[PDB]
A = this chain, B = another copy of it.
Amino acid sequence: GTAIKDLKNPDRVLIGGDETPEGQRAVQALCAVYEHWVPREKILTTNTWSSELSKLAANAFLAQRISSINSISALCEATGADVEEVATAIGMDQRIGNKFLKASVGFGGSCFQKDVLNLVYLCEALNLPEVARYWQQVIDMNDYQRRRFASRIIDSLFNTVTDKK
C-alpha cells in the first residue's frame, strides 16, 4: 500500500552475510548499492541467520501487538472499560508507541499469520516447545477474537440465524 515510500525512505535495510572475508565483501557490495539513496546509519549488517530470523520475528512482534490489544478489548467488554481509551493510554508510553494498537475483529493479510505459523513450526522442529506455544498464542487470540465476534452476533439474534438476511 505504501511500497514506494517504504523503499525510497526505509526505516532500515537489513543485510545478512557469512562472517568471513569473502562473505564480508559480498555484504559490502550489496551495502554499496543501497548507499546510493539510503544513509549508512540506516543500513544494518548481521550474520545470515539473524537476518532471516529478524524478518519473521518483526512480523510476529507486530502481530502480537494487535492480538494483545484485542485481548484487552475482550476484557474491556466485561469491565466497562474502553479499548480505544486504553490503547491511547498505553500508546503514549514512548517505550511502547502508538502504532498497531487499534483493536479489530482480527488481523488479516498474507504475511502475519503465515509468518507466525512458520515461526511456531520452526520452534517445534528445534525442540523449543515453550517458545512455540508462546508465539502460538498470537494466532489463537486472533482466532478467538473472530469467533467471539461471530458468537455475539448469533446470541443477539437468539441463537438462530436460519434464513435471516
Identify whether the interface residues of A are mostly helix, strand, loop, or mixed.
helix
CA distance A76 to B119 in the complex (A): 12
**Shortest Cβ distance from A147 into B: residue:** B130
What is the oligomeric copy number?
A: 3
CA distance A140 to B135 in the complex (A): 12
Question: Do A95 and B95 form a contact, CB below 8 Å, given A89-B51, A140-B134?
Answer: no
Which of A31-39, A60-68, A104-112 forms contacts with chain B?
A60-68
A7 in contact (CB, < 8 A): no
**Shortest Cβ distance from A90 into B: residue:** B58
**Minimum Cβ distance to chain B for residue A123 (Å):** 6
Give chain B residues whose Cβ lies under 8 Å from the Cβ of A67: 134
CB pair A134–B126 under 8 Å, yes or no, is no
CB pair A11–B97 under 8 Å, yes or no, is no
CA distance A19 to B123 in the complex (A): 35
With A12-B92, A75-B126 given, name 18 new contacts (CB 8 A): A12-B93, A47-B82, A49-B80, A49-B82, A50-B85, A52-B81, A53-B76, A54-B90, A57-B86, A61-B68, A62-B93, A67-B134, A68-B134, A79-B126, A95-B97, A95-B99, A127-B127, A134-B137
